Amino acid sequence: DLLLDVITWVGILLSLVCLLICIFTFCFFRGLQSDRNTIHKNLCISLFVAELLFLIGINRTDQPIACAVFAALLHFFFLAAFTWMFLEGVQLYIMLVESRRKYFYLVGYGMPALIVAVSAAVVCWLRLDTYFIWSFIGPATLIIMLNVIFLGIALYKMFHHDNIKSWVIGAIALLCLLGLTWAFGLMYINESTVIMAYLFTIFNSLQGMFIFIFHCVLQKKVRKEYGKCLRTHA
Secondary structure: OHHHHHHHHHHHHHHHHHHHHOOOOOOOOOOOOOHHHHHHHHHHHHHHHHHHHHHHOOOOOOOHHHHHHHHHHHHHHHHHHHHHHHHHHHHHHHHHHOOOHHHHHHHHHHHHHHHHHHHHHOOOOOOOOOOOHHHHHHHHHHHHHHHHHHHHHHHHHHHHOOOHHHHHHHHHHHHHHHHHHHOOOOOOOOOOOOOOHHHHHHHHHHHHHHHHHHOOOOOOOHHHHHHHHHHHHO
């Protein structure tokens, strides 16, 4: 398990850095700020927190009180990131049919918050032996599928009838990347097979890679603003 952990540190750190490079460029710039800059900022914040909590809580169950906090925080932030891409798909559909910053914050964090508190009322990730690992997976898979539903609706609308097209293609690719990353991420925790846990590292490296290359340098708006700042400063 120790040998595989060496590889995971490389990938998770790369995901943390690649998110970090454009976690602030979503708030450090006063031009980009919009309804797709708050969703894409909270998404990176949630993924950053999830990655950091993973790196600090892979198996450290020596302190039970710390393990419980680790588990609750990770279970909250995973579904927070997933519902934030839900809100990203909803926003991409709305900007296709045609400031709600706090109301996206309400759906983006309230729904994960509602589940965690209610579920708690009834390895440091969770008990994967039935009980309510399925009660976690249910909402997660449901919102992933329904985000796919919106992404497909928008893509089909545009295709049979731009920049929204590129954004929804990037969003569906990013959602598939989260799927194929945090599917092995929930396998690296209860076991240590090199067959999937090792590829979990490269999927984190690609997940962060896509977040940093599509939504931070290939939008022709973040790149232009960063170039403006760079050229003006010196």
